[model samples]
Target: AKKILVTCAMPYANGSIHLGHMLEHIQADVWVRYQRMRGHEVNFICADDAHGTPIMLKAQQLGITPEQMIGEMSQEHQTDFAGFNISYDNYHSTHSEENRQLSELIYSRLKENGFIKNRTISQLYDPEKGMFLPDRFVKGTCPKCKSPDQYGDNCEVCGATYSPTELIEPKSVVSGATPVMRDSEHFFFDLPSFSEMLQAWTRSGALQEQVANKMQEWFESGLQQWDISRDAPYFGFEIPNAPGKYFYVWLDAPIGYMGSFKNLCDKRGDSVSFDEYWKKDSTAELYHFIGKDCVYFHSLFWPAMLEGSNFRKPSNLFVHGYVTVNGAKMSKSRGTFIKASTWLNHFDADSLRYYYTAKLSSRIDDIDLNLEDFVQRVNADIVNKVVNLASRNAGFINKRFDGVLASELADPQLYKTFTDAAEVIGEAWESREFGKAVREIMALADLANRYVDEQAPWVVAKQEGRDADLQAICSMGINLFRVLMTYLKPVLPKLTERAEAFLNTELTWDGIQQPLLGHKVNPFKALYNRIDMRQVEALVEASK
Candidate 1:
């Protein structure tokens, strides 16, 4: 079996899980679930990025210790991911001891290799708080339009975005004290030295074509020494033997992938896997599912960090674009900035998952949730086409034939037609061309529905002495439902369960070869019900 490890970008500890977060997680989950169905040994891992100044300040506002705040946030975040059935094997925290050790180990190795440099940079310092201020921490009048009470870097009134130092008469948001520029020693990772190696890796067909082109843009812009260490008053792992100096959140966040997996191996009593998969000669495929905005960190800095530290770099980085609602960016004022938990309150998780899978593809493109299109697609493809094959045909078999499928398939040629499609659909899934796979599956669904329509099982049910004829036609329809449900098992979880319970078989990858014939079936509740625009209206209102 192939060994594979998959990870999504870690969610920040300071924010709630939103639909944008769901887009990436759902995309990765579909691919991961499909790989698992193919019998691969997959370790789907993720974690909370519980570090940085934002988290520390948020904890202060909440009047809780950063440790306690992170712990509680970890639960809420995991619950949101769990609600969507993310299927993460181990969700650990970046603040764990495992992460601390790995962070220190990587930093020290990079340092020993002369990849670490110290430089003095002047930053706005808040004397009362005894810490250097981030750009947003300093507030002042906008330099462009003299807008009072503006944030440090940007001006809303004049629509000007400028540097923090350009703000006129800046004051610390922490203590309302006028800030001063003070020099402090900061550490930088020598990212420029690994430029050639990164270029070769990108050009060697290891990255997505679009992602590789974007990396070329960064290469043209000239890579800079990446800042790796931050001044104190931050909640993160402190650099070894460097008092008051902590690793920047970006530096430790990607390492959380390793920490989460190491925690999993530790809990499962499999210690050797930590090194076997991370060592320089590792053969296991490794991937990071991240958004397009994070290309620089994951593409350049992450690989260079691993190369300098003697760990294996990711096999590839799966990059996706943003999520839009109703043909535009999600707007809070429009009540379209939906949260994951709030979505579950209105619609079932499977609907959103299927919609996302139907839009996802290999190239990075923005996916619009156009709420109307979503409702129509779910009602049409899921309810009318896929589940209809079972609901319309299952009743006759259950009530009249005592829950027994007919001994033989009525249309063996059509049955093989569905089975033959498994090759292309499987390839599409493996290649990360999710939309193509879904489209292909839905075409088959339409064909199955057409087959039922031709058989006219309802009319056959009304005949006086046509019991065997009705049984054979309905049985063929049920077998078609079995094949279609097998293709959709990775997409719709709850519906697959209901179908499996009714059909009495596990939906395995190769299980479609053996059709359900002469098998006892159980009657079930509704496999799936239709959703309407009224429910959609209520969801938007609740979000507001």
Candidate 2:
């Protein structure tokens, strides 16, 4: 089997996770679960982005040290994810010693390659505070659009983009003090040299086409030397040579993946390194899952950094579009920006998992979860179709057929249908077409429903003298239940486990093509009930 190294974007520890965060995690989780079920050698790692200006700001506001603040938030993040069935193998932080060491090594490599240089440059300086402000530290009216509440990078109102130094009449967002120009020495990473490498690596088709196009556009827009160093009082990794100078958050965020890998190595008492996964090109599949908003960084600048240091290119970078609420971006004013913890309290997390899988496409189009539409889709797909198969048949078999798998299948072609269905399921997932995988699974459920309609198990049970026929019907029900559970191991693991309990066999991907016999039946319960309209309305309102 091939080896896979999977990672999702490290969420900053500044705030609680929201529904959009849930979308990315669920997408990665589903893909990882599918690989595991299909028997691949894979390890997954994620880290909390603990080093950043935002974390520092929150820490300062709370009058606590950044270390204490990130530690507390990481615990809360893990707790919230648990309710959603997101059990990460290793959840680390970017502030660890391992991270610092690895970052230093990568930095040294870039420096030796002439890709990193230190220079004194004019910047927006807060004279009152005696420090050079990062982009977020300074705010002013946009020169082009004249938007009053604009940041140093872009105007949120008119989308006019410029440097912090280019803003006119700038003021510090921190102290509300007028900012003046001051020259400061900082390290910059040369990015233009790797454009050719980035373009070549992208066309290899390991990553999605949309990501390649976005990266090309960002490069064509103008590649600037990245400012990698920040002044003191910032919560981050300090620059190796410059005292009181720190590496910017963006510079170290992606490198956290290497740090987490080293942490895992330390815990396992192994000297294995990340070079094989990220530097060597044997059997390792290096994949990163990130949001569309961060595509430019991952595809363009990130690749440039790696190539400059001679690091191996990423096997693929998976990008997903934004999650909208009711056909619009989630709005706090409308109360549709639901917190992850709050939503976990009211509904099944698996239901949310299934909903995203049904809606997501491996493209650039952002997905909208119309509260009403989400509830309707879940009710129609899960409750009425997928769950209904087990709910209606398992109970009938338990009561009449002594809760045991039937002796022989009635039709051999049914087995062929299952094998063909598994192929479609695998193809859909591998292509990152989760919505199609869902439809394929539902198609199997629909077939099961049709089989039930044809057999009319209730009528078969009522027949006083039809013992063999009833046994055959029970056998068909068991076969259908087994097939459905095998392919569904990715989306709803717990529900699939329930199916395994009813079938009295451990469900595997191979089980879809094979049959189970001589296994005792398990006690059954109603798998899922039709969602009430009230619950649907409430969920829709909550998402809105």
Candidate 3:
């Protein structure tokens, strides 16, 4: 098995984790868990992007220090992730000393490599907030399309990109103050100098074809120097020898990956080697899971920073689209910007996890959280199809056979059919094509249910002479359910644990290859319940 290091994009600490954030974490967690189940050495790391003016302003609004705000949010974030059963080796913060050291070291390396340049640039500064505003922190009429309430970076109406200062009536989102143009000397990374290297890497299959095609447009437009330093009044690492200036949040955020791994090594101490995973030219596979909006940062700026700092670049990038609700952008006014905590208060986490996996594929397509569809789909597949198999068969094993399965297989061919599906399901999981895996699993469940119906063990139970046959038939059904659960363990971890307890065996890939004979199972209990629409309606009401 290969040594792997995986990371999900850092979630900003300024806000609560939403459904959109959950989509990325769930997707990455599913993949990492699958790899671990496959006996691979995998280290999964993520961090809170805890730096920026937004965080500082948010803290100010909350009447707390930035450190205090991040501290509370960080703990809340960890709790939310745990609630969703996200298995992370280390969930760190960008504000740590590890991040500070890495950020400073990378900046110094870039400076020594001649990739750092300083130039006076104009920016929109909020006099009321006493800080310069980033593009996202300002809103105004689009300069090109005249669309009102557009962000400073690009126009949603006309798809036009411009500098924030170009907006006609720009206003700071933080303080609602009219921003004024201010000049500051900022450090910029010589991004255009790495254009050749970037183009080659872009075409080297490190990115999805669609993502690579999009990068081609930027390459055609010509790469520009990327600003690496933010002026003072920012919540980030300060640049060495650059008084009153700090490293841009983007510059230090990605380095948080290294910082997180370093922290993990320090915790594991003698058991793990940090260099084996991150040293230049190291062979460990590095994969990053991110959303499409952040593609430029992960694909372009991240690699350049790593290369300039003499660090190993990522082996591959898995980019996904944003999470939409009911085929539209999530809007707070519409009550579609559902928070993770809001969800846990109403529904079980596995329901959302299973629903997402049914739509998630290797392709970078947006997944929609359609509430009505969610209730119907999860209830039908998970409740009616898969779980029904175990409930139907396990009762017979528990009551008549003293919780023991049959000593011999009733139909070895049928058992082989389920075991034979392991390869395809494993491949789909390994490639992050979870939708395909779910479909395959359901198809197997369908076949198993059909087998149960055909046997009609209830019909055999009435006849006194067919007791042995009934036992064998129900035992076969139990074996099939066990195989299905093993395949689904990554996506439905809690259910797998319950299933393992009921079956009296561990769930693993290898465990599926053999059938349990004369095994005693715990009394079967309902694994999941049918979803009611009222619960979802209550959740929406609470979200508002």
Across residues 65-175, which tens digit of lDDT does each residue of candidate 3 receive? 999999999999999999999999999999999889999999999999999998998888999978888889999999887999998689999999988888888899988
Superposed Cα RMSD, model 1: 0.9
lDDT of 3: 0.91
Comparing 2 with 3 on lDDT, the higher-scoring candidate is 3
Q: Each prediction's Cα RMSD? A: 0.9, 2.4, 2.4
RMSD of 2: 2.4
1-544 per-residue lDDT for model 2 (tens digits): 7778888898889889888889998889888888888888777888998886777877888999989999999998888877788756788988888888877777888999999978888878787866677788888889887878677788888888889877878898777888898877889998877777777877787778887777678767977888888888788888787799988877788888878977886897766555657774546887888998888788877877777777776678889999998788888777778888877766778888888888887886787877777678888987887777667766756676677666667766876787777877888888789988888888888887888779887887878898667767667766876787777778887787777777777888876666765456777656665555577556547765
What are the TM-scores, per candidate, against the unseen true structure? 0.99, 0.93, 0.94
Report lDDT (CA) for all predictions. Answer: 0.91, 0.79, 0.91
State which candidate has the highest TM-score. 1
Better of 1 and 2 by lDDT: 1
**Residue-level lDDT tens digits of model 1 in 1-544:** 8899999999998888999999999999989999999999999999999999989988998999999999998999999999998899999999999999999999999999999999999999999988899999999989888898888679989999998788888899998998999999999999999999999998999789999999999999999998899988889988888899999987899889999999999999997888888999988999999999998899999999999999999999999999999999988888899999999998999999999999999988999999999999999999998899899989999999999999999999999999999999989988889999999999998888898889898898898999998999889889988988888778888788888899888889898898888998999989899999988888888888
